[PDB]
Amino acid sequence: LPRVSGGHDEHGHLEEFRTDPIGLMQRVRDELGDVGTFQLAGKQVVLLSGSHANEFFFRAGDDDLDQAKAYPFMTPIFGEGVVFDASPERRKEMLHNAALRGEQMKGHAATIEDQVRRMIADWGEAGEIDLLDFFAELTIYTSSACLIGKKFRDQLDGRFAKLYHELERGTDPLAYVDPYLPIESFRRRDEARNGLVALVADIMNGRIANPPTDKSDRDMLDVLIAVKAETGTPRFSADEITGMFISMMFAGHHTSSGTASWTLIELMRHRDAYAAVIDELDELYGDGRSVSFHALRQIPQLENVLKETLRLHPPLIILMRVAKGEFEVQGHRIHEGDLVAASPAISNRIPEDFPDPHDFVPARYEQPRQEDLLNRWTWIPFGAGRHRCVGAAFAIMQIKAIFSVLLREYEFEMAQPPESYRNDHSKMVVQLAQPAAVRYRRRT
């Protein structure tokens, strides 16, 4: 198995992975094709790209390509003392049944709409915001309100959002060496989790001390608190509930937050797309129906802008797995213990599949191009096959709900040069580099 160039010998490509992971992965493809390798210290990473190789990846059962130990940076976050022994598929199943059922979508759209109005309540006539600060906080509220419950969300304040952020900043790729290296970002990460457990414990004690007289406001915290082990003792501790809540929201927070920011960035970068979306929204809402109604149904132009934003700026730039056995892909041998990865960042821009891959072209999703549909295994912002993101429908609905409100009320423009808006790839969790100042003005 040949490796990409530039390896720093002993450390391999670890340092490049911590600064320019996309450049590294792209060089692996440019140099080795659909199957190449790079190393993170002693760990071997087999990087797959292209339709054939990606299909292998996405059709692989968790018994051949395990997600289990593929993301060591998450263990200290969900919590060591956790019973996350539920197959990643079991987890997806529980989350779905609890908060992602189709019949729940309309209520979620209304919740999200409400949360957005609450966030822009004091915006006034005009001003400026930082995209990361705004969307990171907004999605903490939409996520908690929808996935856990409005009652729970209402018991939260800025502290929760700030601590959660420290969790995401605690995902330095060095976790592939040791998730407990004595570095400050990992220390802040561990303190942040203890801070979150404390906030939840406080709320828990309040729920237990004064049981909800109502019942129609009952949320996921109430549900978890009531569960009893066979011995008859409460099944979950504040620590486990916190871990479960963190897990419920993690995959959906930074992805939705970053996607909302980039959707607005691309709209502002392309004046004609922006105009097209504004006219579409105006016409659409002119029928007098609600956001909860329209956000669940098609909004063509805004959706093609979202699909293109996702193709160019996928929030998860690399998907990881650990080979549980011996495999072979296009002649390249994969060994047990090897890390195996797929990359939306790289695959979403393969020129043979997506002409002019670096250009923003929403029309590539209209007929007859329908590039997302004709390139199932390479258009993968949400993954594909059995590992397709379980929150996709929710994420799509949220984006529509969020912008239906924002773009109908305010108009935005960059407060910085267009090139200044970019991602920070120093942690496994991608987020906008700051500042990302944007000016807003109430629409007349």
Ligand code: HEM
């Ligand atoms: C535009 C935003 C989103 C993008 C592009 C995205 C992307 C992805 C991708 C590519 C994966 C599979 C990664 C892998 O195989 O390791 C994934 C998994 C997952 N996504 Fe999403 N996602 C988004 C929003 C959300 C939302 C809003 C939710 C929650 C309602 C969510 C919940 C999940 C879950 C539960 C998993 C599996 C990880 C776990 O069990 O903790 N995603 N997502």
Ligand SMILES: O=C(c1ccc(O)cc1)c1ccc(O)cc1
């Ligand atoms: O960055 C590393 C590192 C560890 C292994 C390797 O091959 C290259 C670099 C690091 C960070 C903090 C420490 O305390 C010790 C090593």
Ligand SMILES: O=C(c1ccc(O)cc1)c1ccc(O)cc1
């Ligand atoms: O509702 C849940 C649940 C909690 C967290 C999560 O990420 C998914 C589902 C639940 C209910 C009863 C149980 O015994 C255990 C979990």
Ligand SMILES: O=C(c1ccc(O)cc1)c1ccc(O)cc1
């Ligand atoms: O946020 C995650 C994540 C990883 C495992 C999990 O159970 C939930 C979320 C992530 C971050 C960076 C990546 O490259 C891939 C996934």
Ligand SMILES: O=C(c1ccc(O)cc1)c1ccc(O)cc1
């Ligand atoms: O069909 C979509 C889709 C993606 C964005 C949008 O605005 C509407 C539909 C899709 C494709 C593949 C996935 O894995 C998840 C959703």
